[PDB]
Amino acid sequence: HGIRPVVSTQLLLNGSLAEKEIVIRSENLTNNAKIIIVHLHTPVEIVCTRPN
Amino acid sequence: QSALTQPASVSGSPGQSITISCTGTSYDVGSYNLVSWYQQHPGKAPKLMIYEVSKRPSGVSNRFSGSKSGNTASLTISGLQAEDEADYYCCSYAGSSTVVFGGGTKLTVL
Amino acid sequence: QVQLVQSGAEVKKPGASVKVSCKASGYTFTDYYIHWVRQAPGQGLEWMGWINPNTGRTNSAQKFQGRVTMTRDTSISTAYMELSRLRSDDTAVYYCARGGWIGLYYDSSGYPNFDYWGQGTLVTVS
Numbered sequence A: 001h002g003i004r005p006v007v008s009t010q011l012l013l014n015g016s017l018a019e020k021e022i023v024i025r026s027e028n029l030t031n032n033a034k035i036i037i038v039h040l041h042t043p044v045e046i047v048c049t050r051p052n
Numbered sequence B: 001q002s003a004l005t006q007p008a009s010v011s012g013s014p015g016q017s018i019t020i021s022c023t024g025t026s027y028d029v030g031s032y033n034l035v036s037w038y039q040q041h042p043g044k045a046p047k048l049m050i051y052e053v054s055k056r057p058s059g060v061s062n063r064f065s066g067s068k069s070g071n072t073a074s075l076t077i078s079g080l081q082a083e084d085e086a087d088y089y090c091c092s093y094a095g096s097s098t099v100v101f102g103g104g105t106k107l108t109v110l
Numbered sequence C: 001q002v003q004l005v006q007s008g009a010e011v012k013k014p015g016a017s018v019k020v021s022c023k024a025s026g027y028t029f030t031d032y033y034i035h036w037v038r039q040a041p042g043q044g045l046e047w048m049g050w051i052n053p054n055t056g057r058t059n060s061a062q063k064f065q066g067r068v069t070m071t072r073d074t075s076i077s078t079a080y081m082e083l084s085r086l087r088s089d090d091t092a093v094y095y096c097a098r099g100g101w102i103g104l105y106y107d108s109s110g111y112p113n114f115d116y117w118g119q120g121t122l123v124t125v126s
């Protein structure tokens, strides 16, 4: 249910919210180059605009 | 000539209340909240009275008021004075990026 | 104290272009929009256009595009109203007023928030 193909580089927009503590996920932490993904519990509102 | 329509005079005596109807349509008054009123004493420079539907600047007394109504927003004076016996011109944003005026409303106070 | 000042009453003859000047006294001339207003003698107000000093960009009303263009020079704290191909229907008082506050974001160019006014000039042609 509910996979949104939304593409962003740094912040993740309009994703599903976790149930509990802000879990850290990583394939490895000996290999620092492995990208580390953070999944928030509560949202932060962001609004962008082009006034022109 | 003004795109906006508005009366040219409403007369009376001190202490009354007034409603002066500046009128537009969807493109200038209906879609936007950018409406203002300007006092114009005889032969003097204009003076701002009401800005952004109804926000009284410092120096404007609570003798003046106004409010939006669809495609007509009006000037509501209360507690008249003969000292304020001036002309009054509505003003509003009109899309694209332009500013429009209207009316010739001479207050009269016997 | 802040004030708007203008050139005094003007004399020309019809057809000639007019160069009304508007001085910004006692405030940051870089930080507020300036708006021009016409008033035919003893008649209602007609709206001319605006100018952004810090940007230099302008827009004249549709009734005058290609005939009215405003310019400024910050070193002498003055704005200019150029108006060419003068008809005698342009018989009027010309005003200078201080508009909304300029910002990098947001857009107050078209707000009718004319705060203060200049003492104006009356143009003599017929």
Ligand SMILES: *[C@@H]1O[C@H](CO)[C@@H](O[C@@H]2O[C@H](CO)[C@@H](O[C@@H]3O[C@H](CO[C@H]4O[C@H](CO[C@H]5O[C@H](CO)[C@@H](O)[C@H](O)[C@@H]5O[C@H]5O[C@H](CO)[C@@H](O)[C@H](O)[C@@H]5O)[C@@H](O)[C@H](O[C@H]5O[C@H](CO)[C@@H](O)[C@H](O)[C@@H]5O)[C@@H]4O)[C@@H](O)[C@H](O[C@H]4O[C@H](CO)[C@@H](O)[C@H](O)[C@@H]4O[C@H]4O[C@H](CO)[C@@H](O)[C@H](O)[C@@H]4O[C@H]4O[C@H](CO)[C@@H](O)[C@H](O)[C@@H]4O)[C@@H]3O)[C@H](O)[C@H]2NC(C)=O)[C@H](O)[C@H]1NC(C)=O
Pocket: A047, A049, B051, B052, B055, B056, B057, B058, B059, C028, C031, C099, C100, C101, C103, C104, C105, C106, C108, C113, C114, C115
């Ligand atoms: C994303 O996030 C963005 C943020 O990062 C966000 O951007 C923000 O958007 C909002 C839009 O909602 C912007 O809001 C506007 O901000 C304006 C700027 O106001 C601030 O700064 C001024 C600076 O004051 C200068 O001038 C005085 C003299 O008056 C000087 O003495 C000062 O020193 C100062 O500095 C100048 O002069 C110095 C001289 O040495 C120079 O050195 C210096 O360089 C300067 O040149 C402050 O005055 C403001 O505070 C005052 O106002 C508030 C609100 O009323 C009061 O609570 C407070 O106590 C102060 O009194 C403020 O700090 C605002 O001016 C502007 O407010 C006017 O416009 C709105 C509509 O936009 C009107 O609704 C409102 O009523 C205000 O109207 C007054 O001002 C206009 C002129 O703009 C007049 O035409 C009008 O008649 C009215 O007049 C006032 O004065 C009259 C006498 O002159 C008096 O009679 C009246 O009664 C009235 O008091 C508006 O709030 C905000 O700026 C953006 N943020 C930034 C950082 O830009 C963006 O939106 C976000 N986007 C999204 C999508 O989320």
Ligand SMILES: *[C@@H]1O[C@H](CO)[C@@H](O[C@@H]2O[C@H](CO)[C@@H](O[C@@H]3O[C@H](CO[C@H]4O[C@H](CO)[C@@H](O)[C@H](O)[C@@H]4O)[C@@H](O)[C@H](O[C@H]4O[C@H](CO)[C@@H](O)[C@H](O)[C@@H]4O)[C@@H]3O)[C@H](O)[C@H]2NC(C)=O)[C@H](O)[C@H]1NC(C)=O
Pocket: B003, B027, B094, B095, B096, B097, C062
């Ligand atoms: C951002 O940019 C857009 C344009 O890209 C601006 O939108 C324009 O706004 C102007 C407002 O003046 C519109 O022009 C006016 O059109 C009125 C009629 O509406 C036309 O457009 C609608 C929408 O398609 C149709 O339904 C309708 O049938 C028309 O095709 C006219 O009544 C106006 O002219 C009359 O009044 C003026 C004085 O007020 C006189 O000088 C005229 O001679 C005439 O009597 C006026 O022409 C324009 O149509 C809008 N364009 C579009 C594409 O929508 C935005 O305003 C601008 N700003 C913002 C914040 O969005």
